């Protein structure tokens, strides 16, 4: 199965659809359809009934429809890599962005055993904690198990990072990812964004209200923000996918993103 037919179908974009058809074709030895049958994305294809199906293919149809629920029902597993690697591109982004727009001084990286920064080049005191921390970086690291009951006092200068690190309640002033909410009251969910101030550079146009660039302040969209973009979201699409979700302080604002330029 290509990659992106291992995310959830609601994920999938018209041409991931047409790449199922013709998968489904060679695993089940159906009769070939012409792959502009199902001209919509997975969110369409999921409305559609299976009487829709059969119009739509009267040879395969029926099948294709099954297939789907049954896709539906039991999700195939992800690649831990892929999913490794899609989460850090997205805690870099997030966590860059959040010292851009609100230049706190300290950052506060809670349940971090490795002493690694994700946004090495900002301009802030990197500060690592970790009830456990790895034997060959504890030497930097402070041994602590954060619990809102006995912390929330602390820690209230700059911002905190809790890469999936679940603990009870998050303070006010903390970038999350959680993996699956009593815990999130002091946040907001984090909507999708993407941010860069990497060069424009030229050689299907990009509308979007999310590509936060310097080309989009006119909503132009340069080749290679727009690869980046689309890269980046593919990404994003397989983190939240796989039941991780981003929460943030109240007070962040894309605008902020937008005034760097
Ligand atoms: N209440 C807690 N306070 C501090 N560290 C914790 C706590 N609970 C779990 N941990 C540590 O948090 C880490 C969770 C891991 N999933 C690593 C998360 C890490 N931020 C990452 O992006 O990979 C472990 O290293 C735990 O030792
Ligand atoms: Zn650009």
């Given at each position: 199965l290509p990659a992106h037919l291992r995310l959830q179908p609601i994920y999938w974009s018209r041409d991931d659809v047409a790449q199922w058809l013709k998968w489904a074709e060679n695993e089940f030895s159906l009769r070939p359809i012409d792959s502009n049958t199902f001209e919509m994305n997975g969110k369409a294809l999921l409305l559609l009934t299976k009487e829709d199906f059969r119009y739509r293919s009267p040879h395969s149809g029926d099948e294709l429809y099954e297939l789907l629920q049954h896709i539906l029902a039991q999700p195939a597993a992800g690649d831990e890599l892929k999913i490794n690697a899609a989460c850090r591109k997205v805690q870099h982004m997030v966590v860059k962005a959040a010292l851009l727009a609100d230049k706190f001084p300290v950052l506060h990286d809670i349940?971090?055993?490795?002493?690694?920064?994700?946004?090495?080049?900002?301009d802030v005191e990197w500060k690592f904690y970790d009830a456990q921390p790895c034997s060959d970086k504890a030497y930097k690291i402070e041994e602590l198990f954060y619990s809102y009951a006995t912390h929330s006092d602390k820690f209230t200068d700059g911002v905190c990072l809790f890469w999936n690190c679940n603990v009870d309640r998050y303070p006010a002033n903390s970038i999350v990812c959680r993996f699956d909410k009593s815990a999130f009251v002091n946040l907001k969910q984090l909507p999708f964004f993407y941010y860069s101030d990497s060069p424009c550079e030229s050689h299907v146009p990009l509308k979007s209200?999310?590509?936060?660039?310097r080309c989009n302040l006119g909503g132009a969209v340069c080749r290679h923000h727009a690869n980046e973009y689309r890269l980046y979201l593919d990404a994003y699409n397989m983190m939240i996918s796989a039941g991780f979700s981003l929460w943030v302080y109240k007070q962040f604002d894309t605008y902020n993103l937008w005034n760097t330029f």
């Open positions: 349940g971090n055993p490795k002493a690694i920064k994700c946004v090495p080049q900002a209200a999310t590509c936060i660039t």
